[PDB]
Structure formats: C-alpha cells, structure tokens
Scaffold this active site. Structure first.
Site, PDB file in Angstrom:
ATOM      1  N   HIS A 201      27.645  19.998   9.379  1.00 52.44           N
ATOM      2  CA  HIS A 201      27.866  18.884   8.467  1.00 52.44           C
ATOM      3  C   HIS A 201      28.672  19.429   7.294  1.00 52.44           C
ATOM      4  O   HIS A 201      28.096  19.967   6.352  1.00 52.44           O
ATOM      5  CB  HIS A 201      26.539  18.253   7.993  1.00 52.44           C
ATOM      6  CG  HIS A 201      26.733  16.987   7.219  1.00 52.44           C
ATOM      7  ND1 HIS A 201      26.845  15.752   7.825  1.00 52.44           N
ATOM      8  CD2 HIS A 201      26.888  16.770   5.890  1.00 52.44           C
ATOM      9  CE1 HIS A 201      27.037  14.826   6.902  1.00 52.44           C
ATOM     10  NE2 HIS A 201      27.057  15.416   5.720  1.00 52.44           N
TER      11      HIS A 201
ATOM     12  N   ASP B 185      24.834  11.843   7.484  1.00 49.37           N
ATOM     13  CA  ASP B 185      25.292  10.648   6.765  1.00 49.37           C
ATOM     14  C   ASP B 185      24.959   9.393   7.568  1.00 49.37           C
ATOM     15  O   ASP B 185      25.741   8.450   7.646  1.00 49.37           O
ATOM     16  CB  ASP B 185      26.796  10.704   6.459  1.00 49.37           C
ATOM     17  CG  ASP B 185      27.138  11.630   5.294  1.00 49.37           C
ATOM     18  OD1 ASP B 185      26.261  11.850   4.434  1.00 49.37           O
ATOM     19  OD2 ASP B 185      28.273  12.152   5.250  1.00 49.37           O
TER      20      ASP B 185
ATOM     21  N   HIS C 289      34.893  10.507   8.138  1.00 47.07           N
ATOM     22  CA  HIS C 289      34.758   9.134   8.616  1.00 47.07           C
ATOM     23  C   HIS C 289      35.731   8.783   9.738  1.00 47.07           C
ATOM     24  O   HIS C 289      35.604   7.703  10.324  1.00 47.07           O
ATOM     25  CB  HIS C 289      34.954   8.138   7.462  1.00 47.07           C
ATOM     26  CG  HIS C 289      33.941   8.264   6.366  1.00 47.07           C
ATOM     27  ND1 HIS C 289      33.927   7.429   5.265  1.00 47.07           N
ATOM     28  CD2 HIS C 289      32.903   9.121   6.198  1.00 47.07           C
ATOM     29  CE1 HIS C 289      32.938   7.779   4.460  1.00 47.07           C
ATOM     30  NE2 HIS C 289      32.302   8.802   5.003  1.00 47.07           N
TER      31      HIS C 289
ATOM     32  N   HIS D 127      26.196   5.504   8.061  1.00 48.19           N
ATOM     33  CA  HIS D 127      26.129   4.891   6.731  1.00 48.19           C
ATOM     34  C   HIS D 127      25.276   3.619   6.714  1.00 48.19           C
ATOM     35  O   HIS D 127      25.575   2.649   6.008  1.00 48.19           O
ATOM     36  CB  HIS D 127      27.517   4.613   6.181  1.00 48.19           C
ATOM     37  CG  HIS D 127      28.201   5.847   5.674  1.00 48.19           C
ATOM     38  ND1 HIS D 127      28.365   6.104   4.328  1.00 48.19           N
ATOM     39  CD2 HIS D 127      28.749   6.901   6.331  1.00 48.19           C
ATOM     40  CE1 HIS D 127      29.009   7.251   4.180  1.00 48.19           C
ATOM     41  NE2 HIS D 127      29.251   7.758   5.380  1.00 48.19           N
TER      42      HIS D 127
ATOM     43  N   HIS E 290      30.459  14.226   8.902  1.00 46.50           N
ATOM     44  CA  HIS E 290      30.677  14.043   7.468  1.00 46.50           C
ATOM     45  C   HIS E 290      32.000  13.325   7.238  1.00 46.50           C
ATOM     46  O   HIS E 290      32.155  12.632   6.228  1.00 46.50           O
ATOM     47  CB  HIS E 290      30.656  15.354   6.673  1.00 46.50           C
ATOM     48  CG  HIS E 290      30.810  15.164   5.195  1.00 46.50           C
ATOM     49  ND1 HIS E 290      30.030  14.284   4.474  1.00 46.50           N
ATOM     50  CD2 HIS E 290      31.657  15.732   4.304  1.00 46.50           C
ATOM     51  CE1 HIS E 290      30.383  14.327   3.202  1.00 46.50           C
ATOM     52  NE2 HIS E 290      31.367  15.198   3.071  1.00 46.50           N
TER      53      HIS E 290
ATOM     54  N   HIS F 143      21.141  14.481   2.138  1.00 48.07           N
ATOM     55  CA  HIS F 143      20.317  13.476   1.485  1.00 48.07           C
ATOM     56  C   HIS F 143      19.435  14.110   0.403  1.00 48.07           C
ATOM     57  O   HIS F 143      19.088  15.289   0.475  1.00 48.07           O
ATOM     58  CB  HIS F 143      19.450  12.746   2.514  1.00 48.07           C
ATOM     59  CG  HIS F 143      19.007  11.395   2.049  1.00 48.07           C
ATOM     60  ND1 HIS F 143      17.843  11.201   1.338  1.00 48.07           N
ATOM     61  CD2 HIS F 143      19.594  10.177   2.157  1.00 48.07           C
ATOM     62  CE1 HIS F 143      17.731   9.920   1.029  1.00 48.07           C
ATOM     63  NE2 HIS F 143      18.776   9.276   1.522  1.00 48.07           N
TER      64      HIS F 143
ATOM     65  N   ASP G 117      27.646   9.639  11.021  1.00 48.67           N
ATOM     66  CA  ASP G 117      28.248   8.947   9.874  1.00 48.67           C
ATOM     67  C   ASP G 117      28.063   7.434   9.957  1.00 48.67           C
ATOM     68  O   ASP G 117      28.959   6.652   9.609  1.00 48.67           O
ATOM     69  CB  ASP G 117      29.728   9.315   9.743  1.00 48.67           C
ATOM     70  CG  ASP G 117      29.920  10.780   9.383  1.00 48.67           C
ATOM     71  OD1 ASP G 117      30.023  11.065   8.192  1.00 48.67           O
ATOM     72  OD2 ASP G 117      29.890  11.648  10.289  1.00 48.67           O
TER      73      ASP G 117
HETATM   74  C1  LIG Z   1      11.987   9.150   7.290  1.00 43.41           C
HETATM   75  O1  LIG Z   1      13.121   8.907   6.432  1.00 43.41           O
HETATM   76  C2  LIG Z   1      14.308   9.414   6.898  1.00 43.41           C
HETATM   77  C3  LIG Z   1      14.492   9.703   8.241  1.00 43.41           C
HETATM   78  C4  LIG Z   1      15.712  10.234   8.681  1.00 43.41           C
HETATM   79  C5  LIG Z   1      16.741  10.512   7.782  1.00 43.41           C
HETATM   80  C6  LIG Z   1      17.943  10.993   8.352  1.00 43.41           C
HETATM   81  C7  LIG Z   1      19.180  11.258   7.750  1.00 43.41           C
HETATM   82  S1  LIG Z   1      19.693  10.939   6.163  1.00 43.41           S
HETATM   83  C8  LIG Z   1      21.251  11.504   6.413  1.00 43.41           C
HETATM   84  S2  LIG Z   1      22.327  11.519   5.149  1.00 43.41           S
HETATM   85  N1  LIG Z   1      21.453  11.912   7.669  1.00 43.41           N
HETATM   86  C9  LIG Z   1      20.331  11.741   8.418  1.00 43.41           C
HETATM   87  O2  LIG Z   1      20.304  12.074   9.593  1.00 43.41           O
HETATM   88  C10 LIG Z   1      16.552  10.210   6.424  1.00 43.41           C
HETATM   89  C11 LIG Z   1      15.312   9.719   5.984  1.00 43.41           C
HETATM   90  O3  LIG Z   1      15.016   9.420   4.687  1.00 43.41           O
HETATM   91  C12 LIG Z   1      16.137   9.238   3.867  1.00 43.41           C
HETATM   92 MG   LIG Z   2      26.439  14.354   3.400  1.00 37.65          MG
END
Ligand SMILES: COc1ccc(/C=C2\SC(=S)NC2=O)cc1OC
Ligand SMILES: [Mg+2]
Ligand SMILES: COc1ccc(/C=C2\SC(=S)NC2=O)cc1OC
Ligand SMILES: [Mg+2]
EC number: 3.1.-.-
Lengths: 329, 326
Positions: free
Chosen positions: A185, A63, A223, A21, A221, A99, A19
């Site tokens: 998550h 996150d 905080h 952010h 997830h 994501h 998390d």
């Molecule tokens: C290559 O580009 C990236 C590489 C890793 C992530 C990881 C993420 S995003 C999230 S929410 N939690 C995670 O572990 C996201 C990427 O592109 C948005």
């Molecule tokens: Mg999420």
C-alpha cells in the site's frame, strides 16, 4: 463449507481489488452526490465475476473506506457486508490502507484468528495462507509504516528502513512453498501522469525494489489501473468509481490474475463500467456557452464540472436546471 | 461434538468484567488490570477444567461506555478467543456507545460457529459443545428505544411485550431455553442504584418462567434472584469501588438436566478487599491505627473523617494502598 484439497495443483486464480472508498460523498462543497449506489453496483459486478471465474484467493489492498477517521455506520456496514460476500466465494487477504482507527489491528487479529477464510496483514511480517483449492500462498505484506513514517526525522534513514523491510520480504519470499504474493500500500516512484496529490506524506517506493521472486505484486492506494511492470507482474487495480475530476481518463475496476508454475502470469481487467466525468471549459459564460452546457449535460450519463476564467455576471440557476451538473468553478 | 447429550448442559456464566478500569483516578489511580486478568484466568481455567458446554457473557465487559483503550479492547478480544477455544460463546453486550458494535457483532457471528452476539430481542438458536440445541432469549438495554421514552407507562408496556414475546418463543424450545438479560431487577435487596440514572428496571416475575436458566448481567454483586426459573447475576470479578466491600465476586457454573432442577456452583474470584476506615479526628493515635491497618491489609483502603483535623500528615504518599481520603 471450507476449502478443497487438490493434489499437485500448480495453478492459482486471484481476484485483486482495491481502493473502494466506501462511504464517499463527492462534491460536498458544491452539490453533494452520495456515490454509494454506483459503488455498490460496481462491487456487485466484481463479486459476481469472482464467483463466475471461481477464484481461489481474493486480495484487498486498502483504502476500502473513504474516511481515514471514524467511517459512517453505513460505510462500515457495506465494508463488512462485502467482506462476507467475498469470504463466501474464496479466502480473502486484507492489507488495509492508512486508517486512523487504533483498534483496527486488534479487530484484524481477532477475525483472522476465528476464521480460516479471512486474513488481515497489518505489519511487515509474512503470513502463509491457504487458498480455496488448498494452494499454499506466502503473503509478503508492506503496509503504510506504523508512524515509523512520522517517527523518522531523516529521509535517508527512513528510505533505508523501507528498503531493509523490502530485502527481508525478498528473503522470506525465497522460503516459498507454492506461491508468493507481495501486497503493498504505497505510491510507486515516477508514476506516469500521477497528480501526486501535491505530494506530502506519501510513501514512495521504487518499483525495482519490489521483490522480483514473487509471483504477483498486488498494490493499492492509486485510483487508476496501472500495470507497473511484468516481472514481477505488479498491478494497481484502480478504484471502482471516478472519485473526483482528474479521474476522467482512468481505467476503473479490478483484476483477475492466473498463476501457473513454470509459466508467466496472465491477467484480465474486470472493468467497473463507472459513470463518466467531464470538465467543460469556457472563456466566459455567454449565451453560446449556456446552450453548450445545457445540451452537453442533457445527454451525458455522468457528472459534469464547468470551469470558466472571466467574470460573467450572475449565472442562471444552472444546477437547479441540470441534475448532473455538480460543480461550477 | 455431536452426542447429542441432549439431557445435560454445563454452563459457565460470567459478566461485568469492566476491562480497562483504573480506580480512584482523582485521588490515587490504581490500574486494576493485573488483578482483573488474574480473576479472568481463574475463570477460564475453571471453565476448561469443568469442560463446560456453553459460555454466556452478559455485558459491561468494558468499563468505559466511550471508546475503550487499546489495551482494554485487546484484553477483551483476547479472553473472547480463550473462551471460544473452550466452548461456544454467546455474548449479550451492555449499553456501550460504539455505534459499530452491532455491525462487529453481526460480522463475527457470521464468520465463526463458536461465538454468537445477541444484540436485539430476536431469539437465536445456537449449538453447545456437545451438540445441545439452546434457544437464546435475549433482552439487552432497549436500543435507545429507551431514549424513545415519552411516558413511563408506554415504556414499561413496550418492555413487557418483549418479555411476553420471549416467553412464547421459549415455548418453541427444542432442548434448552436460556434467557439473557442486561438490566436491573426491581427491588434489588441493597442496591445503591447510582440514583437510578437511565436504568432499566424489570420485575423478576416477568422473566419468562419456562426458560431453563435466566443469565443476567449489569449488577456488580453475585445475586441468586430466584430459583424458578433459576436467575443469577454472577457479579463483577473485582471490587470496583467502595460500596462493594461485602459483595461476592466471581462467575457461576450452572448445570442443567432436563426433567431435573438446575444446579450451580459459584466460581469465586478471590478479589482484593476494600475497607473504609472512620475516625472522628485524625490525631496521632488515629494515624498509627491507619498506618498499622494498611501495613497488614492486602487490599485498598479509604479513610473518611468528619471533624476538621488541619493539614494532614503525608497520609497517602506514605501508604501505597491508601487510595482515598474524603
Ligand atoms: C471493523 O472496522 C473496520 C474493518 C475493516 C477496515 C478495513 C480497511 S480501512 C482501509 S483504509 N483499508 C481497509 O482495508 C476498517 C475498519 O474500521 C475502519
Ligand atoms: Mg491509505
Ligand atoms: C470490537 O470491539 C468490541 C467488541 C466487543 C464488545 C463487547 C461488549 S461492550 C460491553 S459494555 N459489553 C460487551 O460485551 C465491545 C466492543 O467495542 C467497544
Ligand atoms: Mg450497560
């Protein structure tokens, strides 16, 4: 430089953080504050503790980026930068959050294939990984469902789907070799004092359904640091910074977990020492309220919000005066 | 391995894959993936068979400069992995729009010793499959330093100073020095230029003469640009659109030996052919010519005609490999 191989090693040291952010700017509608400097200071602290304790395995539970959409170049740079720093310390396992980037699974598959020091888990399929001293760790992952969450009309069928995935992970955890670690998550049901974010579109899981035969259940997830239960030891690390008001009283940081065969797991928190938040509440912004606001903020090392009910005319330029006053509402 | 075998270097150089392209989307969309993967598999198997030491990729590996499709990006990362399993790979990307590409490139270069992304003018020393040390001298599209174009004179001087710097760095060679460039050589014999919108043109004589090989990408046809230093565009692997009927398509296998002139063989892609048919007027004799030609033609056909010929008979709906009428 790769992994050692220790004969009959029955111990595993874990850093679990979540998390982050990365990329968040707070209070953009009132006084935008780029949280990067504070957040990187906290991440540096977490990296340094991980190196000092010589952890065997690093768990990241999603996150890690603030924006669900395309993150800024600087946010992605920071994310990859700290992934590299963590990989230099110990093998990393990454369970990303929900994501939107459709290429994320492809990137995750690619980097998992080309490096023995990082693993992306983005499905319910278990993965066997090797920790820094050769320990074999079966990862039991539970990401946000791949729009199987949206692809479901029925609350009953969706809940049964989630439980059946949990049952399968339980069975796979029994096929363990040395250690089994659950990574999830989602939002645990009935969280004491959780806003719920006016809940809509969350995945809510009963904590009793987390497979009890795992050695540790790493959740992300949420905080705030939360020890959800002791068997199996189930923890949200929390975020590393106080993202918005409401998080004044949260504990923020990461967790160090030590597993030993035949013994109960033990953990310590790695506190992030975040900047504090304060909401100041007043009936009316009178001269007695103005000196309270000015005197409080002048000695407060964090960010301050002011809330007041009754109309009080045109206020003086409080935010121009007070650098850490970020919101009046 | 370590031999060091510092006298020979076997190179596979391929470029301009254009993964993700669907052709003739406005007339009869043809998804080129099956043909293109067949050519890529052929190139991969040849690389494994010849036991190459080094694999060079010089850009336009994706058709879309914008966000590529999931399937196109999957294919790209798939073949990168297949190539990394064969020999170390050096990738000089084309002028893609993704602002994260440099970050992705840096990240994967840091976590794997079998792939290197070159995305600036900085030279990079890499190690080949048998331990050969190879100084890479890269020349990508200017990093919108090209947009930082006020004067044609100032921009060309910037480009030439980078070439001069790569020349000097090439002198600090150990074993082999390899130039990789993504641009258009000046005065390319029979190049359409796409009316030269936003192209980078480099005089081939300014390519550093002290490199053992200059691997270029961005041009869709195989071209031996010059012999000293050996300078090659491999070409694309498929005929992307009409205009490429006569191109040679494939990759190149290059063998370098110090104190010896470089040698190379083409690895032909066996692409499907393209044909444009011309008629003054679409009469019943012209239609049977069109229908009979397409029935025995293993590729894609365009029909062009000058004179008005009324509403056409169902020319294309009839014929599956007739993809354009204009
Ligand atoms: C290559 O580009 C990236 C590489 C890793 C992530 C990881 C993420 S995003 C999230 S929410 N939690 C995670 O572990 C996201 C990427 O592109 C948005
Ligand atoms: Mg999420
Ligand atoms: C992770 O995603 C990517 C990985 C590689 C590339 C390479 C390219 S693109 C081009 S043109 N030439 C190249 O070599 C592009 C990517 O995102 C569009
Ligand atoms: Mg380009």
């Amino acid at each position: 430089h790769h992994h050692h191989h220790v004969i009959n090693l029955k111990e595993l040291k874990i850093l679990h953080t979540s998390d982050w952010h990365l990329g968040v700017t707070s209070w953009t509608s009132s006084r935008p504050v780029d949280r990067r400097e504070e957040l990187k200071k906290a991440l540096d602290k977490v990296v340094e503790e991980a190196e000092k304790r010589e952890v065997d395995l690093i768990l990241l539970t999603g996150d890690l980026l603030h924006s669900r959409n395309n993150p800024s170049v600087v946010a992605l740079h920071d994310l990859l930068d700290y992934l590299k720093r963590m990989m230099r310390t110990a093998p990393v396992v990454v369970l990303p959050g929900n994501h939107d980037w459709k290429g994320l699974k492809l990137f995750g598959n690619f980097v998992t294939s080309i490096s023995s020091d990082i693993t992306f888990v983005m499905s319910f399929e278990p993965v066997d990984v090797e920790a820094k001293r050769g320990q074999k760790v079966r990862i039991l992952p539970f990401p946000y469902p791949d729009e199987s969450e949206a692809l479901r009309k029925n609350e009953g069928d969706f809940r049964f789907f989630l439980e059946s995935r949990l049952n399968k992970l339980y069975e796979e955890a029994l096929k363990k070799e040395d250690f089994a670690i659950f990574m999830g998550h989602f939002t645990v049901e009935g969280l004491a004092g959780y806003a719920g974010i006016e809940q809509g579109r969350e995945i809510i899981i009963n904590r009793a359904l987390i497979p009890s035969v795992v050695d540790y259940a790493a959740l992300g997830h949420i905080h705030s640091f939360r020890e959800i239960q002791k068997q199996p030891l189930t923890i949200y690390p929390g975020s590393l910074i106080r993202i918005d008001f409401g998080e004044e009283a949260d504990e923020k940081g990461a967790v160090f977990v030590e597993l030993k065969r035949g013994e109960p797991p033990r953990y310590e928190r790695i506190d992030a020492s975040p900047l504090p938040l304060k909401t100041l509440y007043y009936k009316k912004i009178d001269t007695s309220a103005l000196k309270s606001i000015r005197d409080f903020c002048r000695n407060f090392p964090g960010y301050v919000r002011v809330v007041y009910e009754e109309d009080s005319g045109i206020l003086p330029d409080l935010m121009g005066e007070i650098d850490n006053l970020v919101k009046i509402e």
